[PDB]
From a paper:
The catalytic activation, the catalysis itself as well as the final disassembly steps are driven by so-called DEAH-box helicases. They all belong to the helicase superfamily 2 (SF2) and share at least eight conserved sequence motifs (motifs I, Ia, Ib, II, III, IV, V and VI) spread over two RecA-like domains that together form the helicase core.
A structural analysis revealed that a serine in motif V is involved in polar interactions with one of the ligands in all structurally characterized catalytic states. Since Prp22 could not be crystallized in the presence of an ATP-analog, an existing crystallization condition for ADP-BeF3−-bound Prp43 was used to structurally characterize motif V serine mutants of a DEAH-box ATPase in this state. The structures of these three mutants show that motif V is able to adopt the same nucleotide-specific conformations regardless of the side chain property. The interactions in the ATP-bound state force the serine mainchain to adopt an unfavored conformation, enabling the mainchain nitrogen to hydrogen bond with the catalytic water. Summarizing our data show that the serine side chain is dispensable for the function of motif V and instead has a regulatory role. Instead, the mainchain is sufficient for sensing the adenosine nucleotide state at the active site and this sensing function is sensitive to the flexibility of the mainchain.
Residue numbers in the entry: 60 to 762
Amino acid sequence: GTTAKQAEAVEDSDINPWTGQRHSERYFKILKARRKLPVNKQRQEFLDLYHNNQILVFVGETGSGKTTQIPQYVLYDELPHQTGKLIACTQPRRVAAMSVAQRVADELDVKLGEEVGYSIRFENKTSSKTLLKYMTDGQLLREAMHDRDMSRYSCIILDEAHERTLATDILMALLKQLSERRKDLKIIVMSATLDAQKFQSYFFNAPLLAVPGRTHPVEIFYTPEAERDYVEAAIRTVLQIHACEPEGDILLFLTGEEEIEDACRRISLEVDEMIRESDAGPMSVYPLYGTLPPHQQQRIFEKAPQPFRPGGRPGRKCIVATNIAETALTIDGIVYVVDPGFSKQKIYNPRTRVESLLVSPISKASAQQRAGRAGRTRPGKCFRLYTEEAFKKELIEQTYPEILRSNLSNTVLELKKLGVEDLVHFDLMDPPAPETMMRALEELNYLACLDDDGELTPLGNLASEFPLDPALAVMLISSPEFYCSNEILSITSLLSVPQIWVRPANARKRADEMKAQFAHPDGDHLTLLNAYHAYKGAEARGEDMKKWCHEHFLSYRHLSSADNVRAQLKKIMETHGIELVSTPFHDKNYYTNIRRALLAGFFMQVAMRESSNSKVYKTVKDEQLVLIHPSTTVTTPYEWVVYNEFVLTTKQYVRTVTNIRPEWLLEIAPVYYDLSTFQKGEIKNALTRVAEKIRRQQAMKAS
Ligand SMILES: Nc1ncnc2c1ncn2[C@@H]1O[C@H](COP(=O)(O)OP(=O)(O)O)[C@@H](O)[C@H]1O
Ligand code: BEF
Ligand SMILES: [Cl-]
Ligand SMILES: [Cl-]
Ligand SMILES: [Cl-]
Ligand SMILES: [Cl-]
Ligand SMILES: [Cl-]
Ligand SMILES: [Mg+2]
């Protein structure tokens, strides 16, 4: 219908065709620079491929013009169809969606929020005029829960699709299904660091449009030898650039909040020393991480300070960021990128069902994306703080997908809320193994989160609101029925983080002496509760909690994580009308209530002692032979125990163990422990004798 040549004549017009206003002089200066971008040379090739194909794979270099120009090309092409629909472009980070939408609003000569806008979690900067909306992929996924056919959008552009986050992979699977349902919906998948053929084959052998060329080069520099202290090498590199290199701002990639703020303190102190001793320029230092407020995140676009004198050494800006700034951003003024090659990446412990963060080496794709923050408006340089051979042989090509590094049972419940019926045949790009998916569906059905037809129950919908492994969420939801919901709230939070115990090899006797203060002989779960209670009591006394945790050989990081999780879980209970209850401590049933309440989440992790004096236990699930882990505080374990973690070393253990009574299993999980259909064996015979001894006693007193 409309060619690239026809659209360019409308772009050259004195009048804005979207608003009716006169085009500003800033618009024409930007348009002049935009047409020199590498993607503009293949605009008609894009439009021809967009007309004749439903799904398109787009590859071009960092800064070539993918995120800014391609949605504007679609916008000029899509308007005469009069659909009243929107164009969606998903960014990985909130700061990318806000920054790009402001830039494209300037490029279209419109006001941000009116014709170009953004939509993030707590801010919908859109209106009825909005035709192009940049957003996070999590925001589009939240919209798909209420609108499964994506009815507000005519084109959905999945940007930075190489990242393979949980939201990106799920969006790609939903949009692949929707493309067979909705032929009036276009899909564009783009990145600079993409496995193009893998993405093409996944999207029904979609065509590839590859744009070559760069606006400006990025020179890559490697170190001649490996260096362990990457923070020290990062700070040294930043100061060496400020002392010797010409004008240009620095972007430094670090891994977390505490590491960044400490490095920002160290860089500023050394800069203050270089100023008074060497006539160096001023350098402003900006931190950037996800927990920063957005107005303080936006400060990274501020101009570098002026030099101290005419002809003096240049003033400079140093941004110290996580991988929140790894992709999409155009920070004008940046010339230098420092890449230590590390990031906090999510791992999943399958034995504890705990997601946590681990400082890990980055992928080759991530290193190319970090370098691509330079070379956008001027030439750039990237200092990789690792050898060239380490780049070529030690870094993986792409980071492993998040769905294979996450709690799959949490993912299944979210997919049910998104309307996925068949989980076994849900076509993800890199699906989990069918045994792993069937294991998650089996556990969720036994936990009554999915019914026997696979459909979501009200308990499973409520459990999915909690940022927890679903067995922990079921235990928390069920805890008012055991009159100990305040203590289960604490235990659930502690079980959602890694273990708090710190036992260094040179001070293991002192660590055991501190642990014995919290030891409860009837359960490791109560020992965990005592340690958190002592942590909160010392915090209420105004004590240095980093010092307190160090002197008590506890992890301040995991304890403060659990305390922060406990506040989040307490809001969700109060929101959904779930009472916060405690039994008085001197009540005779105080501890038995908490040990009973554990079985509402963990009735499938139960072991029975084999003989009268044996140390060997047999698990209810899969009949494994185990010992009680020697780190337990349970000095005399009962015949029946509940456990948190299966441990496979040179011996097989169950860790985090609490004494239970076997009649509690029949009371709390009677469907799972239905003896009329239970698996035959020594475990069933023992539970049969327990049920018979209950029946013998109730028939006696009734007579
Ligand atoms: N905020 C901005 N300020 C100045 N120039 C910008 C800005 N955003 C984008 N540009 C220019 O437009 C180019 C293309 O940016 P963008 O479309 O985001 O690229 P891509 O997504 O392909 O990496 C940049 O390399 C730069 O030259
Ligand atoms: F590929 Be670009 F840097 F978003
Ligand atoms: Cl974000
Ligand atoms: Cl968001
Ligand atoms: Cl001074
Ligand atoms: Cl972050
Ligand atoms: Cl009950
Ligand atoms: Mg982009």
